Amino acid sequence: YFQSMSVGFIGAGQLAFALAKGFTAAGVLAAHKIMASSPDMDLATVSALRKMGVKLTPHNKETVQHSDVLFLAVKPHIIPFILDEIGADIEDRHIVVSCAAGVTISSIEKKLSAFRPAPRVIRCMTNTPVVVREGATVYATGTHAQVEDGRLMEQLLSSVGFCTEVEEDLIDAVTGLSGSGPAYAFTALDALADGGVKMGLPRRLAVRLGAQALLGAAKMLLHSEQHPGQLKDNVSSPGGATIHALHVLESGGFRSLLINAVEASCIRTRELQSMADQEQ
Amino acid sequence: NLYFQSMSVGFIGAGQLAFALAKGFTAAGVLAAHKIMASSPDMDLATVSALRKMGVKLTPHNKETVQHSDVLFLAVKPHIIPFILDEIGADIEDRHIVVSCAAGVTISSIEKKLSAFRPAPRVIRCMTNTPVVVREGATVYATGTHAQVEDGRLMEQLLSSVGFCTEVEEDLIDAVTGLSGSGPAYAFTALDALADGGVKMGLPRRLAVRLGAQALLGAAKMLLHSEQHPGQLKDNVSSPGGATIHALHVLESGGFRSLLINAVEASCIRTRELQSMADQE
Amino acid sequence: SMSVGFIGAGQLAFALAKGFTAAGVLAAHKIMASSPDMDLATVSALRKMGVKLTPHNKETVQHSDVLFLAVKPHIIPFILDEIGADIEDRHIVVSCAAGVTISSIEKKLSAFRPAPRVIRCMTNTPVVVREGATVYATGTHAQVEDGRLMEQLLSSVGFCTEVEEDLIDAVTGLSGSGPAYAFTALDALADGGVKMGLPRRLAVRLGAQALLGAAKMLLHSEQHPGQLKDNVSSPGGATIHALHVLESGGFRSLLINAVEASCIRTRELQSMADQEQ
Amino acid sequence: SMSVGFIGAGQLAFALAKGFTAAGVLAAHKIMASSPDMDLATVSALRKMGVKLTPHNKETVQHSDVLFLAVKPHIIPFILDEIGADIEDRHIVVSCAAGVTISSIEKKLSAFRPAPRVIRCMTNTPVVVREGATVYATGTHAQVEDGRLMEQLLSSVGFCTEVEEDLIDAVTGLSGSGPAYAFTALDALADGGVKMGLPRRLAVRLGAQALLGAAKMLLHSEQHPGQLKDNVSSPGGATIHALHVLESGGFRSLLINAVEASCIRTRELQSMADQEQ
Amino acid sequence: YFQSMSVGFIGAGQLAFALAKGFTAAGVLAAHKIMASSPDMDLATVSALRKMGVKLTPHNKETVQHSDVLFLAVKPHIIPFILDEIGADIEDRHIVVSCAAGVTISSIEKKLSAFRPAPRVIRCMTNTPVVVREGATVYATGTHAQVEDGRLMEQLLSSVGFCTEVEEDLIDAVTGLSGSGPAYAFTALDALADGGVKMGLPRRLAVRLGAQALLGAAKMLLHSEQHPGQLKDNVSSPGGATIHALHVLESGGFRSLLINAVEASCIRTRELQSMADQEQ
Ligand SMILES: NC(=O)C1=CN([C@@H]2O[C@H](COP(=O)(O)OP(=O)(O)OC[C@H]3O[C@@H](n4cnc5c(N)ncnc54)[C@H](O)[C@@H]3O)[C@@H](O)[C@H]2O)C=CC1
Ligand SMILES: NC(=O)C1=CN([C@@H]2O[C@H](COP(=O)(O)OP(=O)(O)OC[C@H]3O[C@@H](n4cnc5c(N)ncnc54)[C@H](O)[C@@H]3O)[C@@H](O)[C@H]2O)C=CC1
Ligand SMILES: NC(=O)C1=CN([C@@H]2O[C@H](COP(=O)(O)OP(=O)(O)OC[C@H]3O[C@@H](n4cnc5c(N)ncnc54)[C@H](O)[C@@H]3O)[C@@H](O)[C@H]2O)C=CC1
Ligand SMILES: NC(=O)C1=CN([C@@H]2O[C@H](COP(=O)(O)OP(=O)(O)OC[C@H]3O[C@@H](n4cnc5c(N)ncnc54)[C@H](O)[C@@H]3O)[C@@H](O)[C@H]2O)C=CC1
Ligand SMILES: NC(=O)C1=CN([C@@H]2O[C@H](COP(=O)(O)OP(=O)(O)OC[C@H]3O[C@@H](n4cnc5c(N)ncnc54)[C@H](O)[C@@H]3O)[C@@H](O)[C@H]2O)C=CC1
Ligand SMILES: O=C(O)[C@@H]1CCCCO1
Ligand SMILES: O=C(O)[C@@H]1CCCCO1
Ligand SMILES: O=C(O)[C@@H]1CCCCO1
Ligand SMILES: O=C(O)[C@@H]1CCCCO1
Ligand SMILES: O=C(O)[C@@H]1CCCCO1
């Protein structure tokens, strides 16, 4: 529990809700010590945050004045407008944590430094399963972040899933893998359930079994010192059902499609930020 | 309370599934390792050495496993089931609950063999998966002709200690086999490939494996705790024009969904066709 | 009392005028349309409806309060040069042309008279049966009531909402081109019915009715389309077998490809226009 | 004065009862439905509407004049054995089950009482918004007014026409499964809109509205769908570029494949039913 | 001109209209010497026949009593019902010309011989372009057809396009090639017009040019003693536009698709008649 910590979210959408729900469920923050701002209070995420007890305001400057740790939870192209809006309000006490895909620490520090030297900036990439405290988060520390700042952020984000520090040049690739990853999983689970239904299962049972199979397999890999191929080898009996299914996955290039996905998400992330940097 | 039942459990077969279940049950605290006995004609297996390290009793004699057990799991390959039912069928007593885990093998085929000895063998058929080893298995079961209501309830309590467990009609179990039985292998293949994708884009392999596996675990847990359709959860990830919708497009262009349907179908059909051959023999 | 004009008397002018008059929001006699070819079938159909026709774009401007530009995109700069001197304070200029930016229209018109009131829309041919899908963006000098007037008018012939202009090229690829994807699909579904033994007329009727009803269900539902799809398919049944063969062909990706291709072509065409002017 | 019953209280029973009562042709209190599970969401929705619910299929039969069979196809022979002794001269039995033949129904019912009045229909879930597509065939003992009554009832919730029974499995693959093809397409079109920069909610709304309007245009047109498609595409323009990428993927063949697969699976399932009974 | 010839059609659909329009345009038959019967007088083809002056009746027996040459222009599965209906009305003077896809001379003669021995039967396969007198027709003579019967039928069908006698075992293959052929052409013309539209042509002009190109090329081949490949070689200049287009056709397996089509139509024709023969 961080007793003397006030957290704020600029943005009150999917990610702000996911993190606030994760933090409050973890018990590391009380909902009333969290403030979130948004120019649209008609979102289901805003309504959900209100029901949790999170303080809501339309004004980003109030979030800044309330907060010690300030999460930037707006879309990437909104970040430069946000930084110009509240840059004059950043104080020495603030840690600015940008969650926006692609947006570089350099770009954030350049904006904020025009108002006050030495802004404390941390960049993270996380994902929506923080809402069930099983997120995958990486973070990089900025130029003026103190050593305690990174440790504090790792303690906070570790309460809602895996968290580790990385060099910033890995983050766009992490975005393509674990940031976009849940969407690959949801697609796969929808299709696996369709497969169960084709073979005679009710949809509700097929969804439950497919999701439990994926969850269990992921946990096995996380808790094993063994290669995923070895775990795979343990399932298939010679001549059996599983090896027949694996063959039809291979024949469709299943592996290459997932490589294609991570690559496409990473490249698009890099492409979008390159355009943002050209606009500046 | 199941622990205070002091249940003796036996596995005919001492391979991957016997190890996974024994590890899950003992980690759950429902069984003492030394109250489990497993038999195999082959002790040189690595699964047998792991079982022995746990404290499970090991014997080459299937009759010893039967005499020890209260609940008896059949954990041999499907084509070996009729052979061991011939071998120990005379040793099944009225007190036994016989739980077949073998892919494809029907309750009817098991009861026909065992009913030649005692008239009312208590049979349950289940399908589970290796993640019971981390107590996150996906298990279904169907009760046989003579299984008492308390037998299915005991089975559900036991298997719920190592993951999800629900009763089904037997005619669903081959399809379950293709979905959640074979399922972990589809996931391991996907995680290997996702990690390769992370490596291609500049991540160290160890980090890419950790991140991909955490992403899959978290997404699966989200769906299990959500009332929303997976398509809606997917819609919540992807911003307009953004990284995720670009990646989803390349999955669609390869027929990603159809490949997973193909896999479930192929595993289910192979399960059915093997049992048809067995029924013909 | 509102008078409406169409520069251009082609497919879109016909569809909008038919929809407006069927809705009752405009009597045909309040509508004027112009074309340099008074021998088109659309021109004949408009005359039969009661619409006033002229070959002279200046006459349309002098008649109209709301002026729709319904010519091909590459013709827009030509007709703005022709009628720019005739725009007045009362005029609302509504460009329907694919890709053409408010900026490019206002730049041409402002050379003649400051503060042209411009709205850009993207619609589609189903306005002809009052089931169009329309979006609009307001220009620099459009009054607040200009947007509300246009939304009231276009809501009479289908869905209508205001958007930021930078969404319009994407809307073009989705609902602007969308009817053509549907007509292709309906032709193919009918071929499928014929292959399985249905007379062609019945197969066309059933396929179209199925698509209409499914689309209406989705519009009236809070549920995800995947959930509505799940409600159709019984385990092991006919529909899930058919869905598998669609998935195996990458059906979804083809529709994504189509929206993208129409949107990209729209952007590419306007970039070429901007290079010349 | 007509009383209606549903054996089965699932997706189809809900959709038809919602459509009938929205149309005004039936008050909810004239409808009874039965299911062995009174905890389904469809059962709760029917109770909220005013429909009478019972677990006992015999009670539904005793209440009803027109009796809809809305259980899964493999359940039909079981419930015909259960209620066959309770069919009376007044009853019209309307089977909605995919694949199940009039012959198989009449054979079961005639063991109890000669001359059962049987009609077989195929419909689809959009009856829930009164835009269904329904066909029906009359059985051996159905009176002439039985067919006209059923057409009046089912026309209240969509298109309805009489067919020969040997068309019904093909109709199942086209308009019965059809909504699922449309939901798949709408999900994908929305993904395409999102990829090109539209918010998901707007993309879903526009895609669905485009498909609805296009389908309505085809139903109100004498023109071939290819002609309507030709009217959308300007030379060199956005739509023809998008149509090319659909063609390059074999888009049309996938929809033919789907209708065929649903129809063949329907026939295959009924052949298996006929082998067992 | 066949002065003393009355022609009748059992069926008044697409083919009956196409042939009646072709014959009357050729001047070989006056429309009032043609009768057509149908159980549905609400067809556009029936209305078109009425406007031409063709006599219309609902009763197949009246068509038989009126006619000398009797065309069977109903769907193949209707043929056996037709033959049972009017078999007792066939006279010595009648030539029965079956146009139905797949239906064998043997099956027709077996039905009619139960009523009167020695029915004069001819089987043909034609196509819809007889309506513009450019049909492609083949015919086979039955067991009891006199030599003059085949010559008379060739004279009549040659007035509406190409006509030649074949052995009956070629007719199902002809069905897959020139019977179904117009539909392949209409598909190709629709697609070629789409190609013109993509490259900037108005649809009306693209349709006109595509159809004229196909017509001209077909006429060139019909009037040339040269192989289609040689005519093809004469169009393409080295390095030019045409050889570039031919390459993209080859890369898609264009040739194999047309082979697939003829095969699929022929096999389906054989399959359908095999089922008809099983039902008998
Ligand atoms: N959704 C996900 O799965 C994840 C998202 N992210 C990142 O989080 C950020 C937000 O993503 P979502 O929450 O999914 O977007 P979202 O669109 O659900 O929420 C965006 C929020 O920003 C608000 N907003 C717009 N203009 C604003 C302004 N001027 N001041 C304050 N708030 C404003 C919107 O009203 C909305 O509440 C993005 O940069 C994304 O890359 C990172 C990891 C995962
Ligand atoms: N491995 C998996 O992922 C799961 C396997 N299953 C089912 O569990 C059963 C066993 O599968 P695995 O354990 O993977 O096979 P495995 O091959 O690892 O172990 C098979 C065991 O049977 C033993 N055995 C062979 N003949 C025997 C005999 N006459 N008497 C006693 N033991 C004998 C072998 O020595 C070995 O110990 C199969 O029927 C499979 O379908 C079900 C769920 C998941
Ligand atoms: N057809 C559709 O599906 C929709 C079309 N649009 C847009 O509507 C506009 C027109 O589209 P269509 O009506 O389909 O084209 P169309 O070609 O049917 O009509 C074009 C009309 O402009 C006339 N025209 C040519 N030069 C002219 C001039 N100098 N002055 C006045 N009229 C002139 C032509 O004679 C013809 O009447 C295009 O910009 C298109 O992007 C937008 C929504 C959907
Ligand atoms: N869902 C659709 O899109 C359409 C379905 N159909 C046909 O309608 C029938 C039902 O389809 P759905 O409603 O989708 O299935 P559903 O599974 O939603 O409803 C089935 C209902 O039957 C009930 N039931 C099971 N055993 C019963 C018994 N012994 N007595 C009475 N009720 C019993 C179930 O509890 C459930 O209420 C099927 O034959 C299907 O082919 C036809 C047109 C479209
Ligand atoms: N349409 C084509 O391109 C060609 C068709 N054919 C053959 O010509 C025959 C007819 O083909 P279409 O004319 O295309 O079919 P169509 O369906 O246009 O005409 C069929 C006609 O038969 C009538 N009919 C149905 N039952 C009847 C009965 N009991 N007595 C009399 N008339 C009855 C129908 O009312 C309709 O007028 C088929 O056997 C087909 O294989 C052969 C060459 C080309
Ligand atoms: O491949 C196999 O034989 C096994 C069958 C049961 C589920 C796991 O795979
Ligand atoms: O697609 C998107 O905009 C986001 C980017 C961060 C990870 C989730 O996806
Ligand atoms: O897939 C199914 O079982 C149903 C059959 C009727 C039409 C809708 O689909
Ligand atoms: O293809 C075209 O030129 C038009 C653009 C507007 C939407 C309909 O298509
Ligand atoms: O291939 C070629 O170079 C020529 C060009 C004109 C049209 C015929 O082909």
Swiss-Prot record, chains C, D:
Result of changing G249E: In ARCL3B; results in a reduction of protein expression in skin fibroblasts from the patient
Activity regulation comment: Subject to competitive inhibition by the reaction product proline. Subject to competitive inhibition by stearoyl coenzyme A.
Entry's disease: Cutis laxa, autosomal recessive, 2B: A disorder characterized by an excessive congenital skin wrinkling, a large fontanelle with delayed closure, a typical facial appearance with downslanting palpebral fissures, a general connective tissue weakness, and varying degrees of growth and developmental delay and neurological abnormalities. Patients do not manifest metabolic abnormalities.
Enzyme class: oxidoreductase
UniProt effect for mutating R267Q: In ARCL2B; may cause skipping of exon 6
Residue intervals passing through the bilayer: none
Entry keywords, A to Z: Acetylation, Amino-acid biosynthesis, Disease variant, Mitochondrion, NADP, Oxidoreductase, Phosphoprotein, Proline biosynthesis, Stress response
Pfam families xref list: F420_oxidored (PF03807), P5CR_dimer (PF14748)
Annotated positions binding NADP(+): 7-12, 35, 57, 70-73, 96-98
UniProt similarity note: Belongs to the pyrroline-5-carboxylate reductase family.
Positions of modified residues (N-acetylserine): S3
Known catalytic reactions: L-proline + NADP(+) = (S)-1-pyrroline-5-carboxylate + NADPH + 2 H(+); L-proline + NAD(+) = (S)-1-pyrroline-5-carboxylate + NADH + 2 H(+)
GO-annotated molecular function: identical protein binding; pyrroline-5-carboxylate reductase activity
Keyword NADP belongs to the record: yes
Binding site for L-proline: E165, A238, T239
EC number: 1.5.1.2
InterPro entries: 6-PGluconate_DH-like_C_sf, NAD(P)-bd_dom_sf, P5C_Rdtase_cat_N, P5CR-like_CS, P5CR_dimer, Pyrroline-COOH_reductase
Alphabetical GO biological process terms: cellular response to oxidative stress; L-proline biosynthetic process; negative regulation of oxidative stress-induced neuron intrinsic apoptotic signaling pathway; proline biosynthetic process; regulation of mitochondrial membrane potential
Subunit structure: Homodecamer; composed of 5 homodimers. Interacts with LTO1.
A GO term from the CC aspect: mitochondrion
Pathway: Amino-acid biosynthesis; L-proline biosynthesis; L-proline from L-glutamate 5-semialdehyde: step 1/1
Described function: Oxidoreductase that catalyzes the last step in proline biosynthesis, which corresponds to the reduction of pyrroline-5-carboxylate to L-proline using NAD(P)H. At physiologic concentrations, has higher specific activity in the presence of NADH. Involved in the cellular response to oxidative stress.
Protein name: Pyrroline-5-carboxylate reductase 1, mitochondrial
Residues where NADPH binds: A9, Q11, L12, S35, D37, N57, V71, K72, A98, N231
Subcellular localization, as worded in the UniProt entry: Mitochondrion
